[PDB]
Structures are given as C-alpha cells and as structure tokens.
Coordinates of C-alpha atoms and ligand atoms in Angstrom, one line a residue:
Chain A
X1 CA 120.1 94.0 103.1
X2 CA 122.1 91.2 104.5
X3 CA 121.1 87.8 102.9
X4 CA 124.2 86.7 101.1
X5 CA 127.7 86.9 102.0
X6 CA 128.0 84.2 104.7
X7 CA 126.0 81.9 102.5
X8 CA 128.0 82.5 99.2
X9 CA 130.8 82.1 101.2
X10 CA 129.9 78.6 102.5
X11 CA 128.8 77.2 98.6
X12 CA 131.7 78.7 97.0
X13 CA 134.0 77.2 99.8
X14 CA 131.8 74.2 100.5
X15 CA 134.0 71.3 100.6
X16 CA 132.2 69.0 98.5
X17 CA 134.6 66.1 100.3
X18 CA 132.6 66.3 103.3
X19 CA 129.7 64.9 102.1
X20 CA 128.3 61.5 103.2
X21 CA 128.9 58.6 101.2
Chain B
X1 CA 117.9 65.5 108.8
X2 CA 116.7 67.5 105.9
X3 CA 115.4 66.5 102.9
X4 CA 115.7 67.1 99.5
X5 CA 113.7 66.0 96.8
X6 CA 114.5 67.0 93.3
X7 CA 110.9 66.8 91.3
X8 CA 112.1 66.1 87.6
X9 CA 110.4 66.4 84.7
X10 CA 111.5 62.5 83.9
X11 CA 112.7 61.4 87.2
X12 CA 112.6 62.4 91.2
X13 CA 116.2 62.4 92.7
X14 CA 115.8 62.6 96.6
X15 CA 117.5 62.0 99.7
X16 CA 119.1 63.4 102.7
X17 CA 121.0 66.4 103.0
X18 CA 124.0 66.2 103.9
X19 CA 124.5 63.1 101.0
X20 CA 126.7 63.3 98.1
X21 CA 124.0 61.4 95.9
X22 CA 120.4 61.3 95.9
X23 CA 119.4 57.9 97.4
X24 CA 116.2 57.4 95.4
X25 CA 116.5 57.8 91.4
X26 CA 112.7 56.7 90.0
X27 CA 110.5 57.9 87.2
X28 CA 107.8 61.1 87.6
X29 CA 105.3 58.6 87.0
X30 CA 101.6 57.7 89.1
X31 CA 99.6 54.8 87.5
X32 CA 96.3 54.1 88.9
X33 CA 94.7 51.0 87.7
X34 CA 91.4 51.1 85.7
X35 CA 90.3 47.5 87.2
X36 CA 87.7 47.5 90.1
X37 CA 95.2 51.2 93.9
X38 CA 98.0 53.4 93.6
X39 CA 102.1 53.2 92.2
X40 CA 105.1 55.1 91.3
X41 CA 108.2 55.0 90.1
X42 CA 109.8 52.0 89.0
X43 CA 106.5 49.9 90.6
X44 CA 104.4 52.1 88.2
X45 CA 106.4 50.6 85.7
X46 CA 106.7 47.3 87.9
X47 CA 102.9 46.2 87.3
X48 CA 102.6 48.6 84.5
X49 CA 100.1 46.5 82.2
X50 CA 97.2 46.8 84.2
X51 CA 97.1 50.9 85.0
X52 CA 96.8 54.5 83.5
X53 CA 100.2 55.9 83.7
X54 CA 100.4 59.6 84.2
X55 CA 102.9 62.4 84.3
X56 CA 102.5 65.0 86.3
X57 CA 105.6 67.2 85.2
X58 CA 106.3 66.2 82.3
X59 CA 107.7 69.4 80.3
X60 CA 109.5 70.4 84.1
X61 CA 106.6 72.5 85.9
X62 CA 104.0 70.3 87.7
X63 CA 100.5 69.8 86.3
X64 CA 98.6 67.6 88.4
X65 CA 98.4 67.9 92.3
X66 CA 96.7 64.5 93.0
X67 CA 99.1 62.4 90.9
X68 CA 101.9 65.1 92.7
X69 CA 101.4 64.6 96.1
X70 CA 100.7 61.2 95.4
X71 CA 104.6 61.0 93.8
X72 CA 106.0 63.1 97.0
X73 CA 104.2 60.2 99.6
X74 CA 105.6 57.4 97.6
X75 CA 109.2 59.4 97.8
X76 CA 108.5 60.2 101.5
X77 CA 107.1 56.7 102.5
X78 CA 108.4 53.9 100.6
X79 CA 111.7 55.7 98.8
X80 CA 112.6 57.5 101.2
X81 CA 111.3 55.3 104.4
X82 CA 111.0 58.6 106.6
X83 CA 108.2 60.3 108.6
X84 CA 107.5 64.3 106.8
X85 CA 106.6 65.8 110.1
X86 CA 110.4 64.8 111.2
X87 CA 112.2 66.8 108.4
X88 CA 112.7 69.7 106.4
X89 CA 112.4 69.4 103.3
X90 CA 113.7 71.3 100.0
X91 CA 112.1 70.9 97.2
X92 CA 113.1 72.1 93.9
X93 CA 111.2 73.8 91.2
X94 CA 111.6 74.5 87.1
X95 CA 112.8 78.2 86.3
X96 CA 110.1 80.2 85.7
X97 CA 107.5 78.3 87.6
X98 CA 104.2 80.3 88.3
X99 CA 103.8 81.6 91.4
X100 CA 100.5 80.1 92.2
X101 CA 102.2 76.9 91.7
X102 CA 104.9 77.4 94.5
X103 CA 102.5 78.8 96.6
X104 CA 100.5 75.0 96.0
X105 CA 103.6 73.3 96.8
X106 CA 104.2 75.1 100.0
X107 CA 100.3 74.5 100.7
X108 CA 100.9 70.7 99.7
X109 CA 104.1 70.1 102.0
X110 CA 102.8 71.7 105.3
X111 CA 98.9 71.1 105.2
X112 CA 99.1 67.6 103.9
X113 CA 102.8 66.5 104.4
X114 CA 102.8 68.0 107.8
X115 CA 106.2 69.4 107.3
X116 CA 108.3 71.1 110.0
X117 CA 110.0 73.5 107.7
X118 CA 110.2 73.9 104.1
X119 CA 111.9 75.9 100.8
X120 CA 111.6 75.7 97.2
X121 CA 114.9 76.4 95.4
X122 CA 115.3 77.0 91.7
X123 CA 117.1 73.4 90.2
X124 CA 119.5 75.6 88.0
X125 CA 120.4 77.4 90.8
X126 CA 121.5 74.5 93.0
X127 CA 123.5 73.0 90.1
X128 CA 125.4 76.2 89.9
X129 CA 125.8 75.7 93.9
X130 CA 127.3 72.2 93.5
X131 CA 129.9 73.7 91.1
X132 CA 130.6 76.0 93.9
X133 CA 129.5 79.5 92.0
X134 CA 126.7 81.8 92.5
X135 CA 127.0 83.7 89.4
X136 CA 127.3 82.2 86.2
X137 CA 124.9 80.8 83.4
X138 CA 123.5 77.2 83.2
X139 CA 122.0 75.4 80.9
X140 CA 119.8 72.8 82.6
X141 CA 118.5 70.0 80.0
X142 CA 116.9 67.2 81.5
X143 CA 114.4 64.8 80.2
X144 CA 111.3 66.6 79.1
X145 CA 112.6 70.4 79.1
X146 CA 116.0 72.5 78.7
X147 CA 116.9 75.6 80.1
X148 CA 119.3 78.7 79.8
X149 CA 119.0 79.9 83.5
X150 CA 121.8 83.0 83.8
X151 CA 122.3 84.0 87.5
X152 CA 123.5 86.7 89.7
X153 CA 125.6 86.8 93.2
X154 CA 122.4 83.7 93.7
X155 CA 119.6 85.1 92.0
X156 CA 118.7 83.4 88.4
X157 CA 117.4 86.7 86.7
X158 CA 114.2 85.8 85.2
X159 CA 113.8 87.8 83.1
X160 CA 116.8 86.4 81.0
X161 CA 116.2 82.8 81.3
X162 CA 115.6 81.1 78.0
X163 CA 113.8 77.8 77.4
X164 CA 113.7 75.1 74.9
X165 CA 111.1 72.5 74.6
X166 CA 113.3 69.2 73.8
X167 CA 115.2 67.2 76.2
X168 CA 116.5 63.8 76.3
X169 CA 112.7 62.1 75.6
X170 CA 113.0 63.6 72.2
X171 CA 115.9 62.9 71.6
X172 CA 115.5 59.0 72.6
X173 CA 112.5 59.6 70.4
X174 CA 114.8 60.8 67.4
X175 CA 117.4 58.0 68.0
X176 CA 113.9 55.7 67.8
X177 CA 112.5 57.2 64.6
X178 CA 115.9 56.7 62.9
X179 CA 116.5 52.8 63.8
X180 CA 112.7 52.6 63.0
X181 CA 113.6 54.1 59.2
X182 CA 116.1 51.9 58.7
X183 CA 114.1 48.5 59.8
X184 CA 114.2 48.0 63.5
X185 CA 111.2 47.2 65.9
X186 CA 110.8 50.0 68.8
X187 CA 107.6 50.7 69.7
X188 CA 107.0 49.1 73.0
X189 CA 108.1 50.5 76.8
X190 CA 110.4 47.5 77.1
X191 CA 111.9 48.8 73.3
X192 CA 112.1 52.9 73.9
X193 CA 114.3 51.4 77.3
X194 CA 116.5 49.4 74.7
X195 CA 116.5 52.8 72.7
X196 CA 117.8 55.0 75.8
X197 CA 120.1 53.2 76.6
X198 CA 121.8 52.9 73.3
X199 CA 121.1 56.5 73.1
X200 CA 122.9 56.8 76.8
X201 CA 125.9 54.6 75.9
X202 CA 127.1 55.4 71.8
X203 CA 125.4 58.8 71.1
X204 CA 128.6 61.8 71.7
X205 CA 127.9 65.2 70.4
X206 CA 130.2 66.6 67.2
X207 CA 132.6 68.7 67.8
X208 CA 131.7 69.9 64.2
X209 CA 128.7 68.2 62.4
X210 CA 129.8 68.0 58.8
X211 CA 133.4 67.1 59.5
X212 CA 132.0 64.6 61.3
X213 CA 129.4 63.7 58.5
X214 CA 132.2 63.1 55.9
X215 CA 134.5 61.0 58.2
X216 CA 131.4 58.4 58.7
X217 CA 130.9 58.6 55.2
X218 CA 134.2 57.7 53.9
X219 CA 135.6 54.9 57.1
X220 CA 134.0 52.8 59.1
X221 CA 135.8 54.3 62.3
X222 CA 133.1 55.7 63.7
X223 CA 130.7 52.6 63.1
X224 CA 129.3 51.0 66.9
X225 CA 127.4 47.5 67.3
X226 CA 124.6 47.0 69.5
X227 CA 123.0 43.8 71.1
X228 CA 119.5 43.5 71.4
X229 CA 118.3 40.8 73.7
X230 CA 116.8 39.2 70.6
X231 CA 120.0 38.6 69.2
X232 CA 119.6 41.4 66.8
X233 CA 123.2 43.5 66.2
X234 CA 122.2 46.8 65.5
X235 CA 125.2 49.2 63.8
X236 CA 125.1 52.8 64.2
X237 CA 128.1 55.1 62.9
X238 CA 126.3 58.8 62.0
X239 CA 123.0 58.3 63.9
X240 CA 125.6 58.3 67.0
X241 CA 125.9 62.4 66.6
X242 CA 122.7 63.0 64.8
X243 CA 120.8 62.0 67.3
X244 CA 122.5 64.5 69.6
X245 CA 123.2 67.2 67.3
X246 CA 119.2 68.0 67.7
X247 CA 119.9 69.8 70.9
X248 CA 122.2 72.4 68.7
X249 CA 119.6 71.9 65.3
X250 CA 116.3 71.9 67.0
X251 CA 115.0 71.7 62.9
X252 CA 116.3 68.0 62.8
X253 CA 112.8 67.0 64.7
X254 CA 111.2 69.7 62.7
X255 CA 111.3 72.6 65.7
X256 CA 112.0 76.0 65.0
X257 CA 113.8 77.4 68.0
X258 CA 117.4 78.4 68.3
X259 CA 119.6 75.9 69.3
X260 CA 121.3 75.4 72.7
X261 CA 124.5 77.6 71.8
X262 CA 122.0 80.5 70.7
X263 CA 119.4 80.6 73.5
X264 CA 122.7 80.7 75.9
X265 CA 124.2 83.3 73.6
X266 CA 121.0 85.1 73.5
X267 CA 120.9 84.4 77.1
X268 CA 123.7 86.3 78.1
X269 CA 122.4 89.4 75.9
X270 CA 119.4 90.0 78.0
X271 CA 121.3 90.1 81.1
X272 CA 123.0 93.7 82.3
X273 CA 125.6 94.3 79.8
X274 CA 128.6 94.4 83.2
X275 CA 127.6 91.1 84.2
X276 CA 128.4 89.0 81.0
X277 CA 132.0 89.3 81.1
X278 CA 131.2 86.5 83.9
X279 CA 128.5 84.4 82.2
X280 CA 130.9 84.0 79.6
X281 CA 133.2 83.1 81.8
X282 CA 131.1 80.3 83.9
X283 CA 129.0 78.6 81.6
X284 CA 127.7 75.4 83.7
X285 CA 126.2 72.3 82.4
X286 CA 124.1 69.8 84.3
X287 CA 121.6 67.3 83.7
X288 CA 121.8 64.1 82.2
X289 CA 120.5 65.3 78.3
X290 CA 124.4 67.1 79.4
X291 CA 126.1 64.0 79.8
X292 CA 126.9 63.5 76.1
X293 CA 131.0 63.1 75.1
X294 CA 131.8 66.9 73.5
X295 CA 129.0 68.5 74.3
X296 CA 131.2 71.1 76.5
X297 CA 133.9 71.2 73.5
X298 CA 131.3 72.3 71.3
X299 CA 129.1 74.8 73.5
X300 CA 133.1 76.5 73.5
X301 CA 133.4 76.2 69.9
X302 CA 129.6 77.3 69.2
X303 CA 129.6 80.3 71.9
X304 CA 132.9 81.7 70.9
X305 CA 131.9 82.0 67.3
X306 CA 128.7 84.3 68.7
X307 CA 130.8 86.3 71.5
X308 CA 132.9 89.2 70.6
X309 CA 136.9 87.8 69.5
X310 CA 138.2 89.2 73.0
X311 CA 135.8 87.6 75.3
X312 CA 137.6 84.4 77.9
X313 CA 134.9 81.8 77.7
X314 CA 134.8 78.7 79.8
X315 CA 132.6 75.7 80.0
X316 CA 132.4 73.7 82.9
X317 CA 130.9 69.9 82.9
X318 CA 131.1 68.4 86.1
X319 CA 131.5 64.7 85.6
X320 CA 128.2 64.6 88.9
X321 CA 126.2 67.0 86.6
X322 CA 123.0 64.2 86.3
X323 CA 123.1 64.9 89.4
X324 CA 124.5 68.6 90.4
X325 CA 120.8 69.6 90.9
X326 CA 120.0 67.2 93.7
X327 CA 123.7 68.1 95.6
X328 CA 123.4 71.4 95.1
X329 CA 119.8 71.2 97.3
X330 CA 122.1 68.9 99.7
X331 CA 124.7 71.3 100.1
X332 CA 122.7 74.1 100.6
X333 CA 120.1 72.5 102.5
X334 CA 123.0 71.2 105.0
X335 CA 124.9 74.6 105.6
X336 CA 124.6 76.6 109.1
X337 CA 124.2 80.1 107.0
X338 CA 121.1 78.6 105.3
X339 CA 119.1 77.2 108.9
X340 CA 117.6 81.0 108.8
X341 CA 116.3 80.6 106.0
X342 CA 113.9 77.1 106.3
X343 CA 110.3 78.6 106.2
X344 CA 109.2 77.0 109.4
X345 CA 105.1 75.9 110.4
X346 CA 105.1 79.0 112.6
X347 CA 106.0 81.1 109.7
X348 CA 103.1 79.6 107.2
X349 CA 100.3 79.3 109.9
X350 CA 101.0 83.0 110.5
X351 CA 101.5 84.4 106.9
X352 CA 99.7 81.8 104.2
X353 CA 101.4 80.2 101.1
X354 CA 102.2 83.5 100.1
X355 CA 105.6 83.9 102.3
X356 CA 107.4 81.2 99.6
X357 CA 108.1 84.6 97.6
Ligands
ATP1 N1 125.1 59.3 79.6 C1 123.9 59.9 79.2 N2 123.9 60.3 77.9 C2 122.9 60.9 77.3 N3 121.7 61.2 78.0 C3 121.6 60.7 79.3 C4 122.7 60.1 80.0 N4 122.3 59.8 81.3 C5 121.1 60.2 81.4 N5 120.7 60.8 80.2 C6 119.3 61.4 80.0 O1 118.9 62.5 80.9 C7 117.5 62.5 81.0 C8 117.1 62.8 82.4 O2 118.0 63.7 83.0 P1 117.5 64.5 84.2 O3 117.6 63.7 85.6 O4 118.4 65.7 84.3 O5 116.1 65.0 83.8 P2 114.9 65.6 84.8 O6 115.6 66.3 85.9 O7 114.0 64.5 85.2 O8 114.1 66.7 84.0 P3 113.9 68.1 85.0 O9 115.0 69.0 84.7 O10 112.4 68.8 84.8 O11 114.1 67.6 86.4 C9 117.1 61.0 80.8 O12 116.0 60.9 79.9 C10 118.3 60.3 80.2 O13 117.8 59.6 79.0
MG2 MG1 116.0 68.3 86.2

C-alpha cells in the first residue's frame, strides 16, 4: 500500500560503482 | 554488516553486503566420513576419499536440513569467519520454493544460527536487481536447475515462472559423454573437473546450429586443442556448440521439454497480456550455465522468431552475471529503503516462521 517506490528507486538508480572492492 | 549468502544448487556465493563480489565461491557439498567428522566446500573435496559426499540442493531447492545447516555453519564460521548473532543475513531461495521450506529456513537462521534479523529473497529477482530493473524476465540457469522467472514492478509472478531440469552439470555431463565416445578417459572427480573446464573455456553457443554444423564440417576453423595433464591433446571443433546447444535442444540428452528460447517465450504468454511489451523488452540472463559466447545473440534470434514481427526485443548479459544473483542480495541487502524490511528476532519470537510470507 506503500512498499515500493523508494526501494525501486534505489535499485534502479543504485550506483553499482559504490560498491566495495 | 549484513550478510548475504546465495545457497546454489552447485555452489554457495556469500559475503558481505555492501561488496561487489561474493567473498566465498565453494561447492553445495557436506561429506561426512564413514570411518569411526564433518567438511564442505572445497575441504569436502579436499579429503574427499575417505567420506560420503552429499548434496543438499542439488536441482536448486534444498533437501536436507542437517547437511544444510551444516553448509550455512561452515559458510558462517570458517568462509565467512563471522559470528551469526552479529549480522543480518539474506538468504536466497530457488523460484517456486515451498512454503514450508522457507518457513524451515527462517526456523533454521534464528533458532539455531541465532540471527539478529533475516530475509529470503528470490535469486532471480536479485539478478534482475543487479541489472538495475524490477520488471523484466530472467532466465536463471545455474548448475543443477534453469529457470524462466518473469517479474513485475519486484514481484516474480509465480504463476508464470517456467522451469527446466538441466543446467551446466548436464551439460559438463554431455561434453563428458561425447569425449568418452570418441576414446577419452573421464570418469573420475579429478576428470569431470578437467571436463568443466574445457566445457568453461571452448564451448560458445551457435548463433545458428546447422550453419554452424556445415562450417565445422567443411574447414578446420573452428577446431580447438586441449591439454590434459597427461600430455594427452584433445581436439574439439563441433562438440564446442553441441555441447551448449542442449540448453536450446533439450532432446540432445534425450529430454523432452521445450528449450530455453520456448519456456521464456512461453513465459512471457502466461503473464498479463499489458505487461509483455516489457518482458520482451528486458530479457536478463544470469548464472554461469549463461556465460557461454552467443548465447544472448541467439535468445534474440530464437525469441524474435516466436514474438509477433513488431515487438522491440532486448537481451541483456551482464559480463557479472555468474554472479548478478549474489550482488543483487548485496545491493538490496545494503540500501536504507530496505532496513524496514529485515525480519528482526522480535518480529519471529512474536509471530512464528510463518511471517517469511
Ligand atoms: N564461462 C563459463 N561457461 C560455461 N559455463 C560456466 C562458466 N562459468 C561457470 N559455468 C557453469 O555455471 C555453473 C554454476 O553456475 P551457478 O553459480 O549459477 O549455479 P548455482 O547458482 O550453484 O545453481 P543455483 O541457481 O541453484 O544457485 C557451473 O557448473 C559452471 O560449470
Ligand atoms: Mg543460482
């Protein structure tokens, strides 16, 4: 009823750079 | 730190989230021995001649709790070198895993793992996470199982999902029944390894099979030399893209189920008809059985034969996707919006192993 939008919007513009190496 | 263990039907890939790669890669393997007292992973194969190996998920969904949990304390203890109660922990699960089952893995990770905070995740899912998409269709081919996993704005709609019982082990089994027809020795676990691997390195999927067929016929261009350790050269020119071509003719190691281009065709059909415009249009591969040269090329070929003339199709083939499963848990696992969403020990002593739906 409100369990998306934020989260899409962090894996869609997740930068996958900023993960550790 | 979080953690996220990936629980393969060959292999566990696990780690920390927040990672771009799992830091432990080791076979879904427990050998006890039958002398008189416990291994995994590459140990299980490290004294492997005096034990009963076991495997507890082979075909992707898991089948034995002791030999489990005794794979997820060798991942949490030696592998991974941390202490459960300190971290959450993601775990991943096959599409179209039984409910009683998840509900077992969530008993498993708090009662006996003493977890803080846990969450099962779909691996097809994640791997359309790591490619930064939360609708599209995947197919997921591993080592022991392949799936067609469609998904919706996050959902994978399980009532489309298609599977297909032959992975890579079949495949390295194919590659080994056609070197063994034409003389070679591999029987042995040191000689499927040698099989695997030539499998892994010289195997490339046609673009189309009997054009391909009549150019190793008629040149030796497509004609590749391997080196056993025993000296022995072994040349292989057509096997290279038969061996691989199973995945689209399951009948070449006598199956009959539709290949890989039909069950995602077939796929996409049992979804709602408003929402294919967009699996067609995000078709995501991942897993290693994926890593073959034109396998992409031809899903595109294949799929836009089946689809209707006017319909954009794109395959995507993430140069990570061995691994896309395992980042995808690492991604999601490390972002604020998800923190809400960790089932916590308060949350399971209160409502049972029954919350994990
Ligand atoms: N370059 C490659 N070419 C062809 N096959 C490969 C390559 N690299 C890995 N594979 C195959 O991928 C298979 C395992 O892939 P993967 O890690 O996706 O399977 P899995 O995750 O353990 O199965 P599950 O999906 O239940 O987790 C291995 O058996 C391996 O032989
Ligand atoms: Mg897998």
């Amino acid at each position: 009823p409100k369990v998306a939008e934020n989260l899409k919007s962090q894996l869609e513009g997740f930068n996958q750079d900023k993960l550790k190496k | 730190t979080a953690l996220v263990c990936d629980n393969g039907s060959g292999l566990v890939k696990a780690g920390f989230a927040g990672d771009d790669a799992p830091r432990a890669v080791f076979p879904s393997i427990v050998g006890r021995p039958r002398h008189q007292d416990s291994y995994v992973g590459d140990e299980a194969q490290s004294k492997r001649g005096i034990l009963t190996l076991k495997y507890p998920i082979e075909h992707g969904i898991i089948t034995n709790w002791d030999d489990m949990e005794k794979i997820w304390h060798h991942t949490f203890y030696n592998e991974l070198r941390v202490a459960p109660e300190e971290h959450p922990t993601l775990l991943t699960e096959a599409p179209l895993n039984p409910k009683a089952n998840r509900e077992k893995m969530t008993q498993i990770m708090f009662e006996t793992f003493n977890v803080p905070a846990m969450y099962v995740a779909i691996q097809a899912v994640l791997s359309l996470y790591a490619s930064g998409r939360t609708t599209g269709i995947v197919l997921d081919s591993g080592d022991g199982v392949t799936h067609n996993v469609p998904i919706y704005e996050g959902y994978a709609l399980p009532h489309a999902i298609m599977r297909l019982d032959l992975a890579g082990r079949d495949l390295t089994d194919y590659l080994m029944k056609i070197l063994t027809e034409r003389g070679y020795s591999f029987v042995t676990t040191a000689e499927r390894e040698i099989v695997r691997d030539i499998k892994e390195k010289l195997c490339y999927v046609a673009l189309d099979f009997e054009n391909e067929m009549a150019t190793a016929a008629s040149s030796s261009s497509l004609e590749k030399s391997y080196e056993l350790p025993d000296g022995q050269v072994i040349t292989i020119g057509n096997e290279r893209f038969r061996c691989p071509e199973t995945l689209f003719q399951p009948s070449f190691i006598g199956m009959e189920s539709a290949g890989i281009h039909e069950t995602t065709y077939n796929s996409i059909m049992k979804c709602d008809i408003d929402i294919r415009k967009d699996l067609y249009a995000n078709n995501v591969m991942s897993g290693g059985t994926t890593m073959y040269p034109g396998i992409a090329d031809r899903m595109q070929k294949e799929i836009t034969a089946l689809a209707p003339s006017t319909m954009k199709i794109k395959i995507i083939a993430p140069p990570e996707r061995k691994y896309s499963v395992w980042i995808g848990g690492s991604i999601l696992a490390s972002l604020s919006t998800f923190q809400q969403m960790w089932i916590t020990k308060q949350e399971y002593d209160e409502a049972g192993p029954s919350i994990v739906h």
